[PDB]
């Protein structure tokens, strides 16, 4: 979970 | 009446809101263009991608989910995705012409649309029943917003694993529901019911968007349209 | 003078390129739009895309190019993707303006534009030095075809397993392209040699190409804006 | 490579 992890902060 | 941290959850919701949706969904020129097999499944997946980020954004400003652990943010931001997506275009949604409409004459989405994006009318047929049946309660901004936040923050999901403090930020934002529609809607005296309710159609639309997302996903000629982060949040990774 | 089975391999790569390539790039519509951080990867994502599938299309018609193993032809597709792409990309490259010129004024590619796509001067000014170079050879329609060709059967690639069958089909296209310039162009004593050379530029380009895009993948923010084609094609899975 | 080897028929 890349993406979700950045889009998270 | 209403305590001052019921209002200020109320607000921080609202604002949120406000800063994650456009009603004048001028990003749409942005996304691959809608064609009139699977024409509209470049469009439609550029714009599921562009809604999950502003999910993801309006999530973040939910009061407490900032505290959960980045596993169970994914866990509930996995799980409930669609089902806010659906929540949030109901906004879009309109009675006079069954569809939302986002622009133009390109942004205008009928049901025929969504056949062409790979999908069929038995995820469609229940969705504009849901979508009609969410547009009459004519909802106040705070319900919709509330709604979306009560939803998002269901431990009922696969994944979570604090299932008793999502439970309890659930039941704060319910209690800020249940009291504004009190204090605050004429004539809401049933209301909040029928929007407890609306969370139980959004299961089986869930559910039955999963299945089809699955044939869809599984035939790489369809998966490569879709977009790095639709792939990420409707896959299966633990 | 040139033989059939040489003429009929010139016949076929020829018609293969004709159709994967279009000159009105008609399709250009369909990719997200160009904006002049990172406004231009989105089109550039979307274009190196549909280029990549392009490239496909005319591989699976290169003679020979079928009859390697699925393992074989995704090592030579993955390693030469980005060389394929800078050969066929010449095309549609100008000398009058040192652009990509790809249609009205959103499809005219300078190279600035390269720049706010998540790319450096490190790259784009050897490749425009290239394009230039490559322009300059005035190719016949043949010996662009063919040097696709060899670029794409070129032996010394990571992953390649049968280095001795695809060294065999890569100088049968280089004896047919030899005796093409004797045969049939004129003040063509030189071109080959020249042409050979292009291709040790190609190695430089790619290495630099791969170092930028494990930059730009490796930052979640920058990959997702790619698609599951380029993120596989160009992604470091065995 | 999904993808790769679909398009590769
Ligand atoms: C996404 C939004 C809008 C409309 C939403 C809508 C209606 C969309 C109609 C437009 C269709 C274009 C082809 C919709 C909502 C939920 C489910 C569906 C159907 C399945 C979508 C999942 C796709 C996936 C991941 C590839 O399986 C459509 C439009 C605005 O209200 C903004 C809002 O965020
Ligand atoms: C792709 C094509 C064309 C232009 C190509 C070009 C010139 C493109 C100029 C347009 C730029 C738009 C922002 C180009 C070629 C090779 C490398 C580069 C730079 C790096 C591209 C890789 C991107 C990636 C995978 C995200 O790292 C550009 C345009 C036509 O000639 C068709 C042809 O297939």
Request: proline share 4%; net charge negative; with cysteine.
């Amino acid at each position: 979970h890349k993406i979700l992890h950045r889009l998270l902060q | 009446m209403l305590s001052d941290e019921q209002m200020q959850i109320i607000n921080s919701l609202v604002e949120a809101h406000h800063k994650t949706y456009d009603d004048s969904y001028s990003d749409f020129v942005r996304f691959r263009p809608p064609v009139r097999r699977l024409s509209m499944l470049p469009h439609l997946a550029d714009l599921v991608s562009y809604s999950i980020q502003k999910v993801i954004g309006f999530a973040k400003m939910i009061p407490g989910f900032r505290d959960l652990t980045a596993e169970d943010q994914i866990a509930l931001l996995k799980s409930s995705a669609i089902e806010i997506i659906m929540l949030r275009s109901n906004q879009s949604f309109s009675l006079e012409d069954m569809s939302w409409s986002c622009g133009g004459p390109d942004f205008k989405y009928c049901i025929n649309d969504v056949t062409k994006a790979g999908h069929t009318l038995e995820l469609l047929e229940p969705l504009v029943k849901f979508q009609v049946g969410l547009k009459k309660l004519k909802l106040h901004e705070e319900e919709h917003v509330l709604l979306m936040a009560i939803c998002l923050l269901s431990p009922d999901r696969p994944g979570v694993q604090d299932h008793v403090r999502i439970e309890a930020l659930q039941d704060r934002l319910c209690d800020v529901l249940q009291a504004y529609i009190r204090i605050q809607h004429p004539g809401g005296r049933l209301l909040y019911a029928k929007m407890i309710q609306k969370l139980a159609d959004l299961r089986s639309l869930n559910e039955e968007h999963s299945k089809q997302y699955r044939s869809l996903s599984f035939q790489p000629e369809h998966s490569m349209q879709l977009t790095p982060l639709v792939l990420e949040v409707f896959g299966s990774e633990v």
